[PDB]
Amino acid sequence: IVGGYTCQENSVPYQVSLNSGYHFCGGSLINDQWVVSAAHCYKSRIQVRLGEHNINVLEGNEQFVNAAKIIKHPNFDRKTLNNNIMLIKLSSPVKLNARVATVALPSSCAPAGTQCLISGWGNTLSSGVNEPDLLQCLDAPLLPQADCEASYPGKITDNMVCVGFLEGGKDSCQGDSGGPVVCNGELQGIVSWGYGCALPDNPGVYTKVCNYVDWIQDTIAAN
Amino acid sequence: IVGGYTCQENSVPYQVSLNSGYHFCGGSLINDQWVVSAAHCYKSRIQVRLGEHNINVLEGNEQFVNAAKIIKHPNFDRKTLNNNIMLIKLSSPVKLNARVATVALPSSCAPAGTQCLISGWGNTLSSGVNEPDLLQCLDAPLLPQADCEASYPGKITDNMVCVGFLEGGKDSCQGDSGGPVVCNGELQGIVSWGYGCALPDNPGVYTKVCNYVDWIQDTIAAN
Numbered sequence: 428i429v430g431g432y433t434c435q436e437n438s439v440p441y442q443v444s445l446n447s448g449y450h451f452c453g454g455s456l457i458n459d460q461w462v463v464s465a466a467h468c469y470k471s472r473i474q475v476r477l478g479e480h481n482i483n484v485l486e487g488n489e490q491f492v493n494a495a496k497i498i499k500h501p502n503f504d505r506k507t508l509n510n511n512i513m514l515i516k517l518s519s520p521v522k523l524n525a526r527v528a529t530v531a532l533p534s535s536c537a538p539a540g541t542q543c544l545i546s547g548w549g550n551t552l553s554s555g556v557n558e559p560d561l562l563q564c565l566d567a568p569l570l571p572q573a574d575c576e577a578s579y580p581g582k583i584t585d586n587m588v589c590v591g592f593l594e595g596g597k598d599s600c601q602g603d604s605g606g607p608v609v610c611n612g613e614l615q616g617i618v619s620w621g622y623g624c625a626l627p628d629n630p631g632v633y634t635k636v637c638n639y640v641d642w643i644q645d646t647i648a649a650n
Numbered sequence: 651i652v653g654g655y656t657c658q659e660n661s662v663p664y665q666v667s668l669n670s671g672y673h674f675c676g677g678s679l680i681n682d683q684w685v686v687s688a689a690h691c692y693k694s695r696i697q698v699r700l701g702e703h704n705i706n707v708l709e710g711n712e713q714f715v716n717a718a719k720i721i722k723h724p725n726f727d728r729k730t731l732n733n734n735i736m737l738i739k740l741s742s743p744v745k746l747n748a749r750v751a752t753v754a755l756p757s758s759c760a761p762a763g764t765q766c767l768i769s770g771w772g773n774t775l776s777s778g779v780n781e782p783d784l785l786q787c788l789d790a791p792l793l794p795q796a797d798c799e800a801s802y803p804g805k806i807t808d809n810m811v812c813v814g815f816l817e818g819g820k821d822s823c824q825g826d827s828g829g830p831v832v833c834n835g836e837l838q839g840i841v842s843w844g845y846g847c848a849l850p851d852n853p854g855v856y857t858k859v860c861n862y863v864d865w866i867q868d869t870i871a872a873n
């Protein structure tokens with residue numbers, strides 16, 4: 428998260444860190460045993476970490492659970508990033524408390540101009556390297572499709588949405604990938620791609636969750 | 651036991667010590683004349699030691715009985731350790747008292763997350779040699795089958811259960827083999843195998859007692 432702020436502790440209860448020796452991607456908790464994240468964050472062995480705040484210090488509220496199943500969307504396209512979404516079924520169900528809590532799924536799609544919350548333990552700078560220890564938060568709105576498509580000529584699908592600022596300075600970055608975009612208590616996006624981080628005229632491009640409610644449900648009823 | 655504590659004296663009345671000139675394996679008393687253990691703990695001549703606490707000092711409470719019959723499970727695979735259970739018929743029936751007591755057999759297969767008791771006079775270190783004099787105890791839960799198979803690829807059968815901690819530090823070790831895992835006053839496991847002792851991602855493997863009640867009773871009734 429470039430240009431956001433440090434989230435108040437345990438204030439995005441549904442955020443998870445995907446661990447593979449170190450943090451590499453975020454996701455979000457949809458029920459007690461399923462996490463949604465991004466196909467591009469696929470790894471054959473993932474440990475999910477919940478109730479985190481400081482990613483590099485054991486604080487006493489974490490639950491560490493292995494992925495039992497890792498299911499990329501059948502139409503995931505690596506080249507284009509189309510359908511970038513994946514589901515993770517945890518080896519066991521977590522303990523739901525004030526710090527580990529689900530996030531709802533959209534009842535419809537949120538229109539452009541809606542105000543959303545974005546979070547992650549991804550890069551905090553436009554140029555250079557800085558990985559934070561504390562979870563960063565970012566208030567940003569969905570942008571009109573028109574604006575999304577002009578930024579990325581012929582690069583945008585019916586399942587991608589841009590969230591951000593055309594001016595730059597405030598964005599998601601590497602390490603935020605698979606994490607949540609939440610709009611009026613609902614999971615509307617998933618960090619997917621962008622050119623650089625927080626550059627002018629290159630807003631974040633996100634997976635549009637509203638297009639996959641049916642899939643999810645389905646996937647979870649079948650596994 | 652690596653990471654456990656000194657059992658309170660005579661607190662695990664059903665523990666036995668398999669003796670061949672020295673303690674080499676554990677086991678549990680199931681009736682006044684039958685003990686259960688692992689098939690790998692098979693020796694043609696065994697002396698059973700009941701009422702023990704300090705493996706190495708005579709305390710006034712022990713009963714020393716020879717094994718009159720030693721029955722390995724017919725399906726016992728040496729290579730794989732599948733069917734890792736045996737039955738020992740003692741030469742005479744013991745004296746049942748507060749220090750030499752039986753343990754119940756399973757009424758059902760206990761579920762992942764059940765809290766269990768593991769005990770033994772096995773190695774107490776994760777690296778290095780340390781064989782204790784006093785019987786050691788460990789509180790550990792049964793783990794989801796999912797974690798168990800993820801730990802030991804193509805190694806886990808329907809008759810094996812993992813018990814312990816994925817983070818390592820606390821486990822059974824050589825010399826604990828054949829001992830009991832008691833959960834809710836019943837015999838859910840027998841120490842079987844593991845890679846090393848108390849290493850991260852190498853939880854112990856146990857014989858799933860609940861798949862056997864029927865063979866046991868079968869066994870005790872025919873001999």
Ligand SMILES: [Ca+2]
Pocket residue numbers: 479480481482483484485486489
């Ligand atoms: Ca932490």
Ligand SMILES: [Ca+2]
Pocket residue numbers: 702703704705706707708709712
């Ligand atoms: Ca003794």
